[PDB]
Amino acid sequence: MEWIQSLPKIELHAHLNGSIRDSTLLELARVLGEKGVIVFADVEHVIQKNDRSLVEVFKLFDLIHKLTTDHKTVTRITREVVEDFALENVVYLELRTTPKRSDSIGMSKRSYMEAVIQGLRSVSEVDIDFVRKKIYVRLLLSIDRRETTESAMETVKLALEMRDVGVVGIDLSGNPLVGEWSTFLPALQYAKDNDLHITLHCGEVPNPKEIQAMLDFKPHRIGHACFFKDEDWTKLKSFRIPVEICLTSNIVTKSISSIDIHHFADLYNAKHPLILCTNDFGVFSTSLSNEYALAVRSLGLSKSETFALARAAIDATFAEDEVKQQLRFIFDSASPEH
Ligand SMILES: Nc1nc2c(ncn2[C@@H]2O[C@H](COP(=O)(O)O)[C@@H](O)[C@H]2O)c(=O)[nH]1
Numbered sequence: 001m002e003w004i005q006s007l008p009k010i011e012l013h014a015h016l017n018g019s020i021r022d023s024t025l026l027e028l029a030r031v032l033g034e035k036g037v038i039v040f041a042d043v044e045h046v047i048q049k050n051d052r053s054l055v056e057v058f059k060l061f062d063l064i065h066k067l068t069t070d071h072k073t074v075t076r077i078t079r080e081v082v083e084d085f086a087l088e089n090v091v092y093l094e095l096r097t098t099p100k101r102s103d104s105i106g107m108s109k110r111s112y113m114e115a116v117i118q119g120l121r122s123v124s125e126v127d128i129d130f131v132r133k134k135i136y137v138r139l140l141l142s143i144d145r146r147e148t149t150e151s152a153m154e155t156v157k158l159a160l161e162m163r164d165v166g167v168v169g170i171d172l173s174g175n176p177l178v179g180e181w182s183t184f185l186p187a188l189q190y191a192k193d194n195d196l197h198i199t200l201h202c203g204e205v206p207n208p209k210e211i212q213a214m215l216d217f218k219p220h221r222i223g224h225a226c227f228f229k230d231e232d233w234t235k236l237k238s239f240r241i242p243v244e245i246c247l248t249s250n251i252v253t254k255s256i257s258s259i260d261i262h263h264f265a266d267l268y269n270a271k272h273p274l275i276l277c278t279n280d281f282g283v284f285s286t287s288l289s290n291e292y293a294l295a296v297r298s299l300g301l302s303k304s305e306t307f308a309l310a311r312a313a314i315d316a317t318f319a320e321d322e323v324k325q326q327l328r329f330i331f332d333s334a335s336p337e338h
């Protein structure tokens with residue numbers, strides 16, 4: 001829909017390597033096949049036929065990482081993701097990515113993130129502020145649930161060093177059937193005690209103890225919340241933690257059986273803060289405009305209700321007050337139009 005495409009939007013939950021253009025992923029595959037590193041037909045088959053249920057999508061991510069883990073590619077896809085979000089009028093983007101180590105190519109977590117910064121410096125089609133369309137970009141560093149406590153601490157230390165190029169917080173993500181909260185809690189507590197903002201993937205699978213322990217940590221945001229129970233909802237509503245809602249992702253991974261029963265409607269009606277997000281618009285073949293369209297249809301929102309929802313996301317960002325004031329100005333300058 002045209003007016004949804006033109007709506008200024010805020011993206012808080014987008015994984016870099018889950019946001020790659022189809023043609024770019026297949027071009028990387030083709031180039032690596034011409035070098036003999038992979039069998040192009042096999043990789044292409046996985047990309048087309050992986051059903052992207054919660055179990056299968058992490059195998060897909062292993063394949064994506066075999067295609068994308070080198071400095072030049074990280075720079076390229078960072079630029080492409082930012083340009084794609086800006087062209088659908090995302091005015092503020094928190095981009096999250098897991099820094100990667102790869103000794104065989106001389107990649108450290110730090111040099112991975114430097115390739116991300118290089119990608120932001122190469123953005124040309126739009127105006128960008130990371131510390132004619134204009135987009136504010138800020139960065140979240142992801143801890144993957146496969147990692148050790150010490151490796152998670154390395155990521156937190158890097159985030160603290162990189163506050164000067166717009167890192168604002170830390171994410172916990174990766175396969176929810178892997179790893180234990182006790183592994184990551186000490187590193188996340190260090191991050192929080194050093195004033196980094198914290199967002200947690202929470203309740204993607206049934207796990208009552210882990211959900212309660214993540215809620216008691218009091219992160220600044222959580223993502224998904226698909227298998228919360230009533231005591232979980234009560235605690236979340238009392239702590240006022242915003243929820244990153246990923247409609248398409250949830251339906252495809254089979255974490256929520258349909259949009260008509262999705263908890264985002266309850267949160268909306270309970271006046272609990274929620275933000276519509278893409279999660280992985282490349283993996284799940286969507287866009288932030290389409291997520292808004294699904295939500296507007298399902299809830300039956302008017303233009304002005306949709307605009308109020310979009311604007312409310314400003315106070316869930318991890319950005320400094322000056323940036324929030326600028327976002328308020330932008331949204332107000334798009335306010336009386338509709
Ligand atoms: N738990 C979880 N992690 C995800 C999801 N989508 C992307 N990720 C994380 O994001 C990574 C891909 O983006 P990256 O951090 O490599 O840029 C995946 O390997 C995974 O750890 C998701 O739906 N659930």
Ligand SMILES: [Zn+2]
Pocket residue numbers: 013015173201223279
């Ligand atoms: Zn996610």
